[PDB]
Design a protein around this nucleic acid. Structure first.
Ligand SMILES: CC1(C)C(/C=C/C=C2\N(CCCO)c3ccccc3C2(C)C)=[N+](CCCO)c2ccccc21
Ligand SMILES: [Mg+2]
Ligand SMILES: [Mg+2]
Ligand SMILES: [Mg+2]
Ligand SMILES: [Mg+2]
Ligand SMILES: [Mg+2]
Length: 138
RNA sequence: UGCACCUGACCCCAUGCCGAACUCAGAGUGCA
């Protein structure tokens, strides 16, 4: 299955426990979902986004159609993130957390807005989660 | 302007109960 997911359970979760003193494993910050929005024919862009995420994009409308959105959870989230980190990005802004433990990245390369939503309640906990998963910050 | 977060339900719409979800709305946080 997914190496990044295995890295979470084997490496990241125990380090977070040591670092923050969570007394049960279900308290430890987890990835919840990754939402990708691509602003805007539409059929080609939807097919490319479908190919890269493995999931059917919804059409965001003002329609008039204005963008494409996909909410990735579970294995599709992990598989997409493994690609983003290992293939696409080859540092991220460490200040781009939303104040509630979620990370925001806007790309105008290879605009695409990515929200990494976590169960961390603080930016600090979320930053540690993502850094330990291998997100390149600084 | 958009997505995410946040907070709600006059309004289109919604729950085979629940504005949880879906829909919609809004001076604030993040990014583009
Ligand atoms: C270019 C874009 C998406 C952007 C655009 C604002 C666009 C408009 N705005 C501003 C907000 C209006 O509703 C207006 C206003 C009246 C008529 C037309 C417009 C348009 C041109 C659609 N904005 C908002 C500008 C910051 O306030 C950003 C910000 C960062 C990166 C990229 C952007
Ligand atoms: Mg959070
Ligand atoms: Mg009402
Ligand atoms: Mg809500
Ligand atoms: Mg439903
Ligand atoms: Mg809205």
């Amino acid at each position: 299955d997914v190496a990044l997911k295995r890295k979470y359970y084997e490496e990241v979760r125990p380090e977070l426990i040591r670092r923050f003193g969570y007394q049960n494993v279900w308290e430890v910050p987890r990835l919840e979902k990754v939402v990708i929005n691509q602003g805007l024919i539409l059929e080609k862009a939807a097919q490319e986004l479908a190919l890269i995420t493995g999931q059917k994009p919804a059409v965001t409308r003002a329609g008039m159609p204005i963008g494409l959105r996909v909410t990735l959870r579970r294995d599709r989230m992990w598989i997409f993130l493994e690609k983003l980190l290992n293939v696409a990005l080859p540092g991220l802004n460490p200040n781009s957390f939303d104040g509630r433990g979620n990370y925001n990245l806007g790309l105008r390369e290879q605009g695409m807005d990515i929200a990494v939503v976590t169960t961390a309640e603080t930016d600090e906990e979320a930053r540690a989660l993502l850094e330990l998963l291998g997100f390149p910050f600084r």
